[PDB]
Every structure is written in structure tokens, then in C-alpha cells.
Coordinates of C-alpha atoms and ligand atoms in Angstrom, one line a residue:
X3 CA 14.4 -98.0 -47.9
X4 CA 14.4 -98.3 -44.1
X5 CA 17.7 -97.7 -41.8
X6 CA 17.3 -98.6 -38.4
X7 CA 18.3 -95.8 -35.9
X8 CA 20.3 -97.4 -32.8
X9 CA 20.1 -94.9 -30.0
X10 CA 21.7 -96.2 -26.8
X11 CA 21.5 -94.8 -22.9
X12 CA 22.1 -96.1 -20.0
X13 CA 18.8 -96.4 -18.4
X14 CA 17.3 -96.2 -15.3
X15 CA 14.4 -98.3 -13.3
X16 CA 11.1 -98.0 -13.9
X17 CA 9.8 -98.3 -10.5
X18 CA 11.5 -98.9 -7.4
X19 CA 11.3 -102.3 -7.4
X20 CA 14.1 -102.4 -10.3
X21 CA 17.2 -100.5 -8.3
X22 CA 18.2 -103.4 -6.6
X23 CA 18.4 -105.2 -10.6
X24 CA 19.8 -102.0 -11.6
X25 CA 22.8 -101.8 -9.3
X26 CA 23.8 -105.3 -10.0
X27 CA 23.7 -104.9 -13.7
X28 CA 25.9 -101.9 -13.4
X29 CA 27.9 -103.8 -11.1
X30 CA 28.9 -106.3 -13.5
X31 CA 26.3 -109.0 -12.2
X32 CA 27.5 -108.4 -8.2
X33 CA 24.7 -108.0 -5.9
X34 CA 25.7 -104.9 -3.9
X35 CA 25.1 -104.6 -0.2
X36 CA 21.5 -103.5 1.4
X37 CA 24.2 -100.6 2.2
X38 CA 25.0 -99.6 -0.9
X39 CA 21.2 -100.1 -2.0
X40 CA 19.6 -97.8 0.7
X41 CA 22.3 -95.2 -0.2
X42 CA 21.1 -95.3 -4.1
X43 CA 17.4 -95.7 -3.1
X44 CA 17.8 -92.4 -0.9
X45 CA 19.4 -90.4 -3.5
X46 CA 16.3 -91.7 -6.1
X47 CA 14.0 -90.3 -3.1
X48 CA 16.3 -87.7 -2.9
X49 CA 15.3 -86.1 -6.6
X50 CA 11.3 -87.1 -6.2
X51 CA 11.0 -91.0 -5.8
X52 CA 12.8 -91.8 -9.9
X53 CA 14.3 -90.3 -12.1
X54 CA 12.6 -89.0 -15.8
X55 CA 15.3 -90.3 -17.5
X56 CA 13.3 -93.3 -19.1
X57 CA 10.5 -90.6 -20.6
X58 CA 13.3 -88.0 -21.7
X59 CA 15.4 -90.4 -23.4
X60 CA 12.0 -92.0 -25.1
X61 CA 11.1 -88.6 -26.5
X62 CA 14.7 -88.1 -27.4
X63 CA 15.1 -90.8 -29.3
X64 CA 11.3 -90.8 -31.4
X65 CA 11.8 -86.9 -31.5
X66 CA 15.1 -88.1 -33.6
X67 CA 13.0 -90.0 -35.4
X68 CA 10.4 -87.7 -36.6
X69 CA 13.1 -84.8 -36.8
X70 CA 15.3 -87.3 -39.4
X71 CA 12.2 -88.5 -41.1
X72 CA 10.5 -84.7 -41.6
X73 CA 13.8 -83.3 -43.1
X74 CA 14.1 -85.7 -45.9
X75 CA 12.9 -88.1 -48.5
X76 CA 16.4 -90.5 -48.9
X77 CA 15.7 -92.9 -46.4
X78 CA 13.1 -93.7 -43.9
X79 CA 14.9 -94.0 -40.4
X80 CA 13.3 -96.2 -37.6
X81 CA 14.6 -95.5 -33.9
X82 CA 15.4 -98.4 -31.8
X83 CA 16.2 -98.0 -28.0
X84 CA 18.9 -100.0 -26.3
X85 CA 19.9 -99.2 -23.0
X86 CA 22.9 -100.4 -21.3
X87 CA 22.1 -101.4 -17.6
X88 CA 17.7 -102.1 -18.1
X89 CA 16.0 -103.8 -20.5
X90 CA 15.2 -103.5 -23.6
X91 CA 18.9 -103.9 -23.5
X92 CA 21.7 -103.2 -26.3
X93 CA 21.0 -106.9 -27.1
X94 CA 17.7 -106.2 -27.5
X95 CA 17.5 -103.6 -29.5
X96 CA 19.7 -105.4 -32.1
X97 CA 17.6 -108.6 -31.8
X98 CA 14.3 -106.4 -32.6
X99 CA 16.3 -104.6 -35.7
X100 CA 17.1 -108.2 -37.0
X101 CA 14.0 -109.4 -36.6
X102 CA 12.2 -106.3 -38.8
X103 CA 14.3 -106.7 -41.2
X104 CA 16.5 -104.0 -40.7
X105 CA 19.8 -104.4 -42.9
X106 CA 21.7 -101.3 -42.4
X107 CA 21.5 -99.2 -38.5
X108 CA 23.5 -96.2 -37.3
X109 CA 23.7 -96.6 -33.9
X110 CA 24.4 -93.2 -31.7
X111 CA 25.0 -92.9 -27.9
X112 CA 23.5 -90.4 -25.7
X113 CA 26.6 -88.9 -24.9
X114 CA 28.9 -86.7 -27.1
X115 CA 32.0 -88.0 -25.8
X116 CA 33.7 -91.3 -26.0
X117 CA 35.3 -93.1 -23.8
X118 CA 36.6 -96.7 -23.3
X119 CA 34.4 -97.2 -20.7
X120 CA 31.5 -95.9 -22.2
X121 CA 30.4 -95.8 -26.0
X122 CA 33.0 -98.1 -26.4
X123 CA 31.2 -100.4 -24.4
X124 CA 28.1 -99.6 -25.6
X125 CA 29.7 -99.9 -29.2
X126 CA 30.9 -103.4 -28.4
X127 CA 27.9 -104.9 -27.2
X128 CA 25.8 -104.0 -30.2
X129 CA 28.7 -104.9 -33.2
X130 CA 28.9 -108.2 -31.0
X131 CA 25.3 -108.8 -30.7
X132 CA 24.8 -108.2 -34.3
X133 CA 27.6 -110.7 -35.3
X134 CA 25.9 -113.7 -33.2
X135 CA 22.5 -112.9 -35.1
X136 CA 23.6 -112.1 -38.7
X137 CA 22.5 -108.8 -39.2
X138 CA 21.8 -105.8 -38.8
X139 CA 25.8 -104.1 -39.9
X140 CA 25.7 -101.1 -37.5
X141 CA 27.7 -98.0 -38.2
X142 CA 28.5 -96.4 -35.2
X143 CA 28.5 -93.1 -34.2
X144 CA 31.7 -92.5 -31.7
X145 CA 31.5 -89.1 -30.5
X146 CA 29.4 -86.0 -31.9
X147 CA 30.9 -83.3 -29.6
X148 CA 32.6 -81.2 -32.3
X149 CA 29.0 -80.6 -33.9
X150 CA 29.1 -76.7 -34.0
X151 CA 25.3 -76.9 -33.0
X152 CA 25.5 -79.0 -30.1
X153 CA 28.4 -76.1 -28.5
X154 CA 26.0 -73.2 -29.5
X155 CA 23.2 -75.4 -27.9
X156 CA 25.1 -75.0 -24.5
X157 CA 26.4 -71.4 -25.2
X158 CA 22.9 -70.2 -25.4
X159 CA 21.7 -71.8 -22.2
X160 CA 24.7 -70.8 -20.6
X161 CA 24.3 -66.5 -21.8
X162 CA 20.7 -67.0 -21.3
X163 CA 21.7 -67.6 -17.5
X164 CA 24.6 -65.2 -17.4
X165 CA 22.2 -62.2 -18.5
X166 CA 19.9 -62.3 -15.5
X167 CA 23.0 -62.1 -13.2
X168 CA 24.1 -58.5 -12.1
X169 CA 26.2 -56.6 -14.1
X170 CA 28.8 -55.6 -11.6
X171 CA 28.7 -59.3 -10.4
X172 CA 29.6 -61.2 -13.9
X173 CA 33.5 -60.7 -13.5
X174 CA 32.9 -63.1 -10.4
X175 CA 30.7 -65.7 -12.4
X176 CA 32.6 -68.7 -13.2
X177 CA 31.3 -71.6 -15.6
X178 CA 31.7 -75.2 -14.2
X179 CA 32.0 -77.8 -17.2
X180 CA 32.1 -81.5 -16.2
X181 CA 31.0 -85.0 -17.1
X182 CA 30.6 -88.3 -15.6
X183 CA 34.0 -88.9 -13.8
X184 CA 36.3 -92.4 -14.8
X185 CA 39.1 -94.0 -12.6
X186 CA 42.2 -91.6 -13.8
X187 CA 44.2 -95.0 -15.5
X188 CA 42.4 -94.1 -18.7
X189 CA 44.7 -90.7 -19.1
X190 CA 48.0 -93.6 -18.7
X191 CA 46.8 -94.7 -22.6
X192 CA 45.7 -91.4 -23.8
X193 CA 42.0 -92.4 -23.9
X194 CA 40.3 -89.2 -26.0
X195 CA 37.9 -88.8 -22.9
X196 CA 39.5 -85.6 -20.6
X197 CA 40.4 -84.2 -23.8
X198 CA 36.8 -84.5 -25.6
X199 CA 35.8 -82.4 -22.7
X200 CA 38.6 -79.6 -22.2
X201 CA 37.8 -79.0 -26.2
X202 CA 34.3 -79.1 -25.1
X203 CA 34.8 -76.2 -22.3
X204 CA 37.4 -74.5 -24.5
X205 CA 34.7 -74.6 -27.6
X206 CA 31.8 -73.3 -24.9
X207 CA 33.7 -70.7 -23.5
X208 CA 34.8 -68.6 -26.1
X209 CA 31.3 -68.0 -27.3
X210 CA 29.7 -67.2 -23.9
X211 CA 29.9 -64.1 -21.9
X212 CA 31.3 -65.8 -18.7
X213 CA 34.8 -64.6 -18.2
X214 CA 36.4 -67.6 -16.4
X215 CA 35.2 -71.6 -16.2
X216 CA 36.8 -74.5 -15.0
X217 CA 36.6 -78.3 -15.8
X218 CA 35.6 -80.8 -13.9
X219 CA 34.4 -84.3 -12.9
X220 CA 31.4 -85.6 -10.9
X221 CA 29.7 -89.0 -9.4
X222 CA 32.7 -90.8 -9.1
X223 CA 32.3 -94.4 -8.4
X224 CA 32.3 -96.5 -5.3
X225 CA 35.8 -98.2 -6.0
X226 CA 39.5 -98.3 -4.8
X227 CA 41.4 -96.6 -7.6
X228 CA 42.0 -92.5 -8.5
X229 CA 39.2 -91.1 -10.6
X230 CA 39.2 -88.4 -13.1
X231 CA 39.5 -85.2 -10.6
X232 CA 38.8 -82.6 -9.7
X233 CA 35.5 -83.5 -8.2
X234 CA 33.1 -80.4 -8.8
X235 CA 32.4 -80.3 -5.3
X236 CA 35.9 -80.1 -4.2
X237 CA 36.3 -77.8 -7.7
X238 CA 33.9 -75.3 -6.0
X239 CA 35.6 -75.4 -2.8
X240 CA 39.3 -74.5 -4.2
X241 CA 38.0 -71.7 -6.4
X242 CA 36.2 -69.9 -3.5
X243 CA 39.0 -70.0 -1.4
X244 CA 40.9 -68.7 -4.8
X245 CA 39.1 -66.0 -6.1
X246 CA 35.5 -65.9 -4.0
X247 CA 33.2 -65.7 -6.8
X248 CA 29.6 -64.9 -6.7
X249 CA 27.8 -66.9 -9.0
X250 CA 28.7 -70.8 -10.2
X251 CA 27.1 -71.9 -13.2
X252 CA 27.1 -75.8 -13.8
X253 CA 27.0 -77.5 -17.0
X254 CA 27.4 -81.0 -17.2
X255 CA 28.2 -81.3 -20.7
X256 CA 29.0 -84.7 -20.4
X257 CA 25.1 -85.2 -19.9
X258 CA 22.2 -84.9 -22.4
X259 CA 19.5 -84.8 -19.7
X260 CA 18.2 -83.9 -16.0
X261 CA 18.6 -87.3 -14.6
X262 CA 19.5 -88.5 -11.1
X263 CA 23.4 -87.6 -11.9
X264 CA 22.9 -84.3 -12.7
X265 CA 19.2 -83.6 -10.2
X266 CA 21.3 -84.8 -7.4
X267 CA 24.9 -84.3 -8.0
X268 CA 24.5 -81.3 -9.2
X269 CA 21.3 -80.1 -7.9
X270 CA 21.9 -81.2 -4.4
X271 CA 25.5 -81.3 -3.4
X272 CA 26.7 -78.6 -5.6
X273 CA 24.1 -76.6 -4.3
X274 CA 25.3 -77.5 -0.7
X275 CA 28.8 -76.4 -1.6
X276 CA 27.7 -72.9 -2.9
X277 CA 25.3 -72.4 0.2
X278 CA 28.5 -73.1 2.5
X279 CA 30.4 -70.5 0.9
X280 CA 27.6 -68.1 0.6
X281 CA 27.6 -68.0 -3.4
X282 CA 24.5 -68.4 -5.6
X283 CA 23.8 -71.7 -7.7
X284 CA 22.7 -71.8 -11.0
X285 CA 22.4 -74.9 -13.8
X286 CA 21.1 -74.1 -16.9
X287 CA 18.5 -76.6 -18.4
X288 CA 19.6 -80.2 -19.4
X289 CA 19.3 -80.7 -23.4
X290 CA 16.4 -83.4 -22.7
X291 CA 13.9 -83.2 -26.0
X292 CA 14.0 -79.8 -27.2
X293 CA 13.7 -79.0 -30.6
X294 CA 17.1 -77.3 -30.8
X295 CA 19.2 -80.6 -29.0
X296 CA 16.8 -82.5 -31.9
X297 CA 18.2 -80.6 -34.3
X298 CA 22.1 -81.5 -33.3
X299 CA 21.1 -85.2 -33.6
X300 CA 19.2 -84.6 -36.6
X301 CA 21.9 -83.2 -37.8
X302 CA 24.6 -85.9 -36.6
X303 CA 22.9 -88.7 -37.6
X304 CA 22.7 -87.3 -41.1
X305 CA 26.0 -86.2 -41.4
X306 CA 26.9 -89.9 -40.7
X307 CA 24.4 -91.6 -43.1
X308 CA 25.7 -89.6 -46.0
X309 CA 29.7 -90.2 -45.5
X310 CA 28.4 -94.2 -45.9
Ligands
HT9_1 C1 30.7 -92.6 -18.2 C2 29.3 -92.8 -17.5 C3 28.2 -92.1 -17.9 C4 27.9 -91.2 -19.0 C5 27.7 -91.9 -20.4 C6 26.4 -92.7 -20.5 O1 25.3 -92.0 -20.4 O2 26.4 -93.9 -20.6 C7 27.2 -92.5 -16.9 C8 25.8 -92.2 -16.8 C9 24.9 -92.6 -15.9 N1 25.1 -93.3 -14.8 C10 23.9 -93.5 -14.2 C11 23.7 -94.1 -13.0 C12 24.7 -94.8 -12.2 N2 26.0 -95.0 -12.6 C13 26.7 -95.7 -11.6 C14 28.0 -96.1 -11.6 C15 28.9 -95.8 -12.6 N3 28.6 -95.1 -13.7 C16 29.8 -95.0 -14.5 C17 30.0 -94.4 -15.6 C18 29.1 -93.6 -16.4 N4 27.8 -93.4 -16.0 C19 30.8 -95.9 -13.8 C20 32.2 -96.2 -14.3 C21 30.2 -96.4 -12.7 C22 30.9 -97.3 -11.6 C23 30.6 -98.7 -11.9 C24 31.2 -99.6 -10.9 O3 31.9 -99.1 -9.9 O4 31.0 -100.9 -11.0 C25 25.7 -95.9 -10.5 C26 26.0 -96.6 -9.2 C27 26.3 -95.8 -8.1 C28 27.5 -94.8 -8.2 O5 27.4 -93.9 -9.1 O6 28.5 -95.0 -7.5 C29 24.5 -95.4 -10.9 C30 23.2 -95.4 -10.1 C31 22.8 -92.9 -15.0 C32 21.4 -93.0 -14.7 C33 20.9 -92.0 -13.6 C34 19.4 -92.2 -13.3 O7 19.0 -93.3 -13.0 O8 18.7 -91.2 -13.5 C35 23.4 -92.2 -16.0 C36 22.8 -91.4 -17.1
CL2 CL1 28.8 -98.8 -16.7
FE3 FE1 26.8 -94.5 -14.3
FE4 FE1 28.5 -89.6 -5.4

């Protein structure tokens, strides 16, 4: 009959009446200073004003939708959006799923690589909010980076990029894959995280025509404790001052869409660092709703509906 389809995010305000909500919700319920607000409202101003990611992740997760529902006859899937830091919440989502009579949900994160501070959380929220209502029993998805589509996805943008760069100037093209840093203690228990993503790069760069890459981190948080380095900033730095290449090609992997993460850490200071060292910047496109990124979650969701 009808599975519900749990697609999670972590939002992002509507208008810019909602950062200062925002920041204290990802600050675990602490008001952070007029400081530390005018800093995030700049960077929002920064990219535009806001940032799309509240229209790309509703396409995203209705174009999973229509893509699971188009491709088969077995079960009708209904897509339910939960978002981690802005309502409609995780709780939300599972509250509007119980109360249509869903029974059965498989809940995927917008991200294809798990961490405990991330889909764990994101996990834990929704099992936990399903267990205080009754219903629905969600079967989550934990990570869906080994989907052989989702690395040809990147590939592609990546050697569509590479190809308009100079022949003679390729050998000094270099690949940047990164994510969303974490603070470092979560390599001290062999959290899957930094390895989800050196498999990730490893995966990407065998099938592109960039002969050298590098891994790293970006938008580490405001807190007192080692995070997950190198910092791509400091990444491009130390690999001019190596090997002076040309052309630096960003892909943050870790990612699923151009958002204020990736249109200002990446769009701004990146392109700062590569303008300092006289190199050219490039980012291929974020996945965002195109039909092929459809088709890896089409696929993944599928692939987890039949193994239950
Ligand atoms: C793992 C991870 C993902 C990827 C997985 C996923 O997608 O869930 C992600 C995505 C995103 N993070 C986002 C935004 C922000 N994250 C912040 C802060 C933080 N993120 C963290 C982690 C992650 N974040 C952590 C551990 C903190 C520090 C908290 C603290 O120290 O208490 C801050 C505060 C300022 C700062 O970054 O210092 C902002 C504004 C947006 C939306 C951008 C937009 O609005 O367009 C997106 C997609
Ligand atoms: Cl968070
Ligand atoms: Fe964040
Ligand atoms: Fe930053």
C-alpha cells in the first residue's frame, strides 16, 4: 500500500527573521551572541540575502517521490520532510506520518556519509519520536555513498570540468574532495566518517581524468577542540607552496546541494585562496534536483525497500 518516505536535511531559515532561531537550535537551545549573529547574517548576505537550500531540498525530496513512484507498481511511496535545525522538524515529520496512517517509512538523510554527529543524530531523533507516538517503524537508511551511481554522478561533473581546462595545464589540476568538518575526537573511536570520505575520493578518482586530488575538511565550527583537518583553505595553501598547480577543482562530496556551506565556503574563501596564489577556481555543480542525483536516490531507496 503506502510507505512513507522520511527524507531528512538540515534546513535553513526562510527569511531572515529566522537565523537568530536557527543558530540557537543548532546551538543546542544557546542563544549565541549578536556577534556571532552578525557574522552568520553577513555570510547569508554574503551568498545573495538566503540560501536555496529550503527550494532544493523540497524538489529533492518530491522529485524522489515522483522518481520512486514512476519506476514501479509495488508500493506507493509518500515523501515526508524533516529537517533537523527548522521546522517542520524530525518530530514533525514523524508526527505527520503517524497521523496519515503511515505504518512502515524508510527514512534517508541528505548526506551519503554517516557520522555520529550527523545521521546518527538525525536517526535518533526520528526512531525516538516514533516510539513516543506508536508508529510509524522507520527503517533507516545510514549511508548511501558506495552507490556506484552516486560516484559516477561526481566523476561526470568533475571530467565535464577537467575537459575545458588546457591540455598542457591538466598535469597541474588537482581535485579537492571534502565534507562538513567534525571535532577530530570522533577518529579516537573509529567513527566510519573520515573513512566514508577517503573511499569516497579514492572511488572519484580513479574514474576521472584529474591526475592528483587531495582530501579535505571545511566550515569547522566555532568551538574549543581540534576538528577534522586539513581545512581546504589551508589544504590549498600547502599544495601551492608544494607543487604550484594551476587549476583547483572543489567537490564537496560531503554535500548534496549549493547551499550557504558550499556558496560561501567554497565559493568565497576558496576562491580567495586560489586568487592569492594566482591559480584558477573551479566547483563543478552541486547535485541539487537533477534527474541523474534523482536517479541515485531512486535507486537507494529501492534497494533498501526490497532487502525489508
Ligand atoms: C556534519 C554536518 C553537516 C552535513 C550533514 C547534514 O547535512 O546534516 C552540516 C550541514 C549544514 N550545516 C549548515 C549550517 C550551519 N552549521 C553550523 C554548525 C555546525 N554544523 C555542524 C555539522 C554539520 N553541518 C556542526 C558540528 C556544527 C557546530 C555546532 C556547534 O558548534 O554547536 C552553523 C553555525 C555556524 C558555524 O558553522 O560555525 C551553520 C549556519 C547547513 C545549512 C546552510 C544553509 O543555511 O544554507 C548545512 C547544509
Ligand atoms: Cl548539528
Ligand atoms: Fe552545520
Ligand atoms: Fe567558517
Amino acid at each position: 500500500k503506502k510507505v512513507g518516505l522520511l527524507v531528512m536535511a538540515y534546513g535553513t531559515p526562510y527569511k531572515d527573521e529566522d537565523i537568530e532561531r536557527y543558530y540557537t537550535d543548532i546551538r543546542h537551545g544557546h542563544k549565541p551572541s549578536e556577534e556571532m549573529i552578525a557574522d552568520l547574517r553577513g555570510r547569508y548576505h554574503a551568498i545573495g540575502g538566503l540560501s536555496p537550500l529550503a527550494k532544493i531540498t523540497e524538489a529533492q525530496a518530491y522529485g524522489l517521490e515522483k522518481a520512486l513512484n514512476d519506476s514501479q507498481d509495488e508500493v506507493e511511496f509518500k515523501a515526508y520532510i524533516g529537517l533537523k535545525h527548522i521546522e517542520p522538524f524530525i518530530e514533525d515529520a514523524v508526527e505527520a506520518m503517524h497521523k496519515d496512517g503511515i505504518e512502515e517509512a524508510i527514512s534517508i538523510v541528505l548526506a551519503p556519509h554517516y557520522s555520529s554527529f550527523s545521521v546518527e543524530a538525525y536517526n535518533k531523533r526520528a526512531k525516538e519520536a516514533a516510539d513516543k507516538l506508536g508508529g510509524p517503524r522507520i527503517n533507516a537508511i545510514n549511508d548511501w555513498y558506495k552507490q556506484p551511481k552516486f560516484i559516477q554522478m561526481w566523476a561526470d561533473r568533475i571530467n565535464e570540468t577537467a575537459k575545458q581546462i588546457p591540455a598542457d595545464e591538466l598535469l597541474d589540476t588537482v581535485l579537492i574532495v571534502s565534507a562538513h568538518s567534525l571535532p577530530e575526537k570522533i577518529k579516537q573511536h573509529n567513527d566510519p566518517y573520515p573513512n566514508q570520505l577517503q573511499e569516497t575520493a579514492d572511488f572519484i578518482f580513479e574514474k576521472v581524468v584529474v591526475p592528483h586530488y587531495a582530501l579535505g575538511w571545511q566550515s569547522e565550527g566555532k568551538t574549543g577542540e581540534p576538528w577534522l583537518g586539513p581545512d581546504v583553505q589551508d589544504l590549498t595553501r600547502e599544495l601551492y607552496g608544494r607543487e604550484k598547480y594551476k587549476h583547483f577543482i572543489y567537490t564537496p562530496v560531503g554535500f548534496v546541494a549549493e547551499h550557504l556551506e558550499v556558496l560561501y565556503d567554497n565559493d568565497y574563501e576558496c576562491k580567495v585562496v586560489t586568487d592569492e596564489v594566482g591559480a584558477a577556481y573551479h566547483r563543478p555543480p552541486m547535485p541539487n534536483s537533477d534527474p541523474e542525483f534523482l536517479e541515485v536516490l531512486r535507486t537507494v531507496v529501492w534497494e533498501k525497500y526490497s532487502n525489508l
